[PDB]
Amino acid sequence: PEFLNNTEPLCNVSGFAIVSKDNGIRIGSRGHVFVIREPFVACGPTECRTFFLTQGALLNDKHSNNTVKDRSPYRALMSVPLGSSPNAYQAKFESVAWSATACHDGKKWLAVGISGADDDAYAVIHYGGMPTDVVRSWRKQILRTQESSCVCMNGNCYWVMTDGPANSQASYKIFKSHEGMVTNEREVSFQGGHIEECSCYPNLGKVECVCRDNWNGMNRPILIFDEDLDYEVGYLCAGIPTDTPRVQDSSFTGSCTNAVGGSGTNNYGVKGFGFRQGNSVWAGRTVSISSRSGFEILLIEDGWIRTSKTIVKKVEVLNNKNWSGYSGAFTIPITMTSKQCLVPCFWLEMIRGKPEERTSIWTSSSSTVFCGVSSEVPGWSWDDGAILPFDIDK
Ligand SMILES: CCC(CC)O[C@@H]1C=C(C(=O)O)C[C@H](n2cc(-c3ccccc3)nn2)[C@H]1NC(C)=O
Ligand SMILES: *[C@@H]1O[C@H](CO)[C@@H](O)[C@H](O)[C@H]1NC(C)=O
Ligand SMILES: *[C@@H]1O[C@H](CO)[C@@H](O)[C@H](O)[C@H]1NC(C)=O
Ligand SMILES: [Ca+2]
Numbered sequence: 001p002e003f004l005n006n007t008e009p010l011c012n013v014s015g016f017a018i019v020s021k022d023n024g025i026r027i028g029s030r031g032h033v034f035v036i037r038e039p040f041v042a043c044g045p046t047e048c049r050t051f052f053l054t055q056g057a058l059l060n061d062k063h064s065n066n067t068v069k070d071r072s073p074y075r076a077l078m079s080v081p082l083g084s085s086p087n088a089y090q091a092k093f094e095s096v097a098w099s100a101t102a103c104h105d106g107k108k109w110l111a112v113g114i115s116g117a118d119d120d121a122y123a124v125i126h127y128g129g130m131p132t133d134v135v136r137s138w139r140k141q142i143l144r145t146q147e148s149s150c151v152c153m154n155g156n157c158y159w160v161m162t163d164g165p166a167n168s169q170a171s172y173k174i175f176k177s178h179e180g181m182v183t184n185e186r187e188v189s190f191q192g193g194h195i196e197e198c199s200c201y202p203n204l205g206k207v208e209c210v211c212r213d214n215w216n217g218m219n220r221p222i223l224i225f226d227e228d229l230d231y232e233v234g235y236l237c238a239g240i241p242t243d244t245p246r247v248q249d250s251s252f253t254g255s256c257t258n259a260v261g262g263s264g265t266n267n268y269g270v271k272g273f274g275f276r277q278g279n280s281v282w283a284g285r286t287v288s289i290s291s292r293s294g295f296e297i298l299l300i301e302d303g304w305i306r307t308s309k310t311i312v313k314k315v316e317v318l319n320n321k322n323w324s325g326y327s328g329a330f331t332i333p334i335t336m337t338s339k340q341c342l343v344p345c346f347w348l349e350m351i352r353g354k355p356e357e358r359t360s361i362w363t364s365s366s367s368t369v370f371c372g373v374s375s376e377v378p379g380w381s382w383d384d385g386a387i388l389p390f391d392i393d394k
Contacts, residue, residue: 003155004045004106004333007205011341012277013372015315016297018382019345020083022050024366025352025386028059032088034078035064038271039367040328041082041347042149044104045335048082050347050367051094051102051111053147057362058088060392064362066354071098071142077113082369095126099143101159103150106333110150110157110180118142123161127180135182139163139171147197147271148328148347151207156183156227158207160198166214167267170194174229186229193233193259195221199273199329202342210236210274210283210329216266217259218246220274220283235259236274238303240311242285244270244292254307273329275344275372279305280312282372284327284346287320291356294320295327295348296379297370315379317348317370322383325351325365332371345371350384359389 024033034054041050055074057063077097080090094102095113102111108128112135116122121143123135137143143163150159157177164170172195176184188195194215200207200223209223218241225231236242239254245265246252253260270292274283281303287294299313318324325348332343347369353360368382 001107004152004335006153006202006333006342008334009341010201010203010275010331011339011343011372013282013344014313014375015377016346016370016372017377018317019369019371021368021382022083022085022366023385024085025059025364025384027085027087029386029390031085033059034086034088034091035059035362035364036086037349037365038147038326039086039347039349039365040148041330041345041369042103043330043332044109045106045333048332049079050082050084050086051077051079051100052086053077053097053100054086059364060390062392064392066362071118073115077102077111095124099145099147101146101148101150103152103157105152105155105157110152110177112145112150112159114143114145125177125180132180133177133182135161135175137163141165144196146200147326148199149330151200151202153202153205153227160195160200160209160223162196166196168215174225174231176229184229186231188223188231188233190233193217193221195223196269197271198223199271199327201275201329201331201344203276208276210272212269212271213243213259214267214269215259216261218243218265219255219260220272236281236283236303237306238281238283238300239307239309240283240298240300240303242272242274242283244286244289246289248289249309256307271326271328273327273346275329276304282344286324287316292325292351293323294318295324313376315377316381317368317379318350318383319381322381323351323356325349343371345369352384352386352388357388360393362392
């Protein structure tokens with residue numbers, strides 16, 4: 001057991017092939033399956049796992065009653081093998097958490113889980129199962145993190161946190177840890193911009209993040225930083241907006257440096273992802289411009305360095321007749337592909353129930369996972385499949 005370098009370049013991919021589909025809500029119609037959100041994936045040197053947040057209720061149980069949009073003391077971070085349903089008997093407990101990130105050194109699992117009150121929350125760092133350090137809130141306004149896999153290189157692990165208003169200017173910080181101990185941190189000066197729920201991946205020894213602007217941007221913030229936490233910050237250059245809500249593409253002018261919004265798209269967003277491809281970028285986005293429906297991945301030529309509108313490839317993995325949700329990025333290590341680049345992958349969450357389906361008293365989601373390959377692959381629509389409403393809704 002050795003630290004994983006993860007200093008290799010990210011692979012160039014011409015398509016994404018489906019990897020897993022957990023069918024959790026379908027199974028949860030009769031089986032014992034957690035009500036969950038945001039099923040993100042992280043990979044160790046021997047295995048990939050689906051992490052998720054749950055409040056301890058099971059599908060078709062009265063405790064799934066969704067009631068209010070708060071943050072709960074009941075909410076926890078758990079994990080299952082990639083492709084498994086988030087069920088009661090396979091789930092492995094990682095952390096108390098209503099916001100979380102997790103990744104793997106190469107030696108041990110690292111899990112960061114945030115709990116506590118909105119005005120004085122704190123993060124507990126779990127390393128190999130154990131509380132090893134704490135990060136306190138520095139702005140006392142809902143301390144929160146990625147909701148997807150963090151990044152470990154050369155025995156050091158990095159993640160991004162936000163403290164401040166969700167619809168106004170906030171504070172954004174990069175953290176560096178070693179064996180679960182925070183060894184450095186850096187605040188990202190980003191006036192006018194809004195960083196929230198970043199999807200990060202390693203790329204040639206640097207960390208590259210595609211995030212969500214919940215304030216004034218229908219384009220996605222971009223954050224890149226090195227092992228000293230020296231950074232550059234801005235927005236995805238491409239003249240294609242990839243947040244939700246947004247406007248149609250022809251009604252949009254891109255920007256590498258500033259948030260572009262208005263037209264009724266402000267004060268919301270969705271977690272999403274992108275992958276730098278030399279000068280171009282693979283970027284995911286919902287098919288619908290106003291709601292979380294459908295999903296597609298766009299290869300935007302030169303879209304990482306200029307405001308290009310040239311889409312050279314588009315693959316739909318979920319049609320606009322089906323509910324999508326969050327998306328996030330992760331990478332497969334080389335101790336397992338025997339390649340010399342890092343394979344880019346993404347997971348897709350598919351939300352069922354409230355708010356879009358109001359005859360159900362609950363909200364949960366299932367997932368599909370895709371990885372990039374050398375050749376082009378066709379798309380299809382791998383929808384959630386659960387038939388709603390459920391029995392508890394009667
Ligand atoms: C408050 C800042 C963030 C980013 C806008 O806001 C997020 C809005 C999200 C959205 O965009 O829909 C929903 C997120 N969230 C997740 C959950 C939940 C998770 C597991 C079990 C049950 C509920 N509840 N809310 C919420 N992050 C939290 C910690 O509040
Ligand atoms: C869910 O909560 C509402 C409001 O408290 C209540 O009217 C309803 O009966 C509850 N449903 C279940 C299944 O507990
Ligand atoms: C991926 O493609 C870009 C496009 O020019 C190239 O610069 C880069 O070297 C490629 N990376 C690998 C690992 O092949
Ligand atoms: Ca937005």
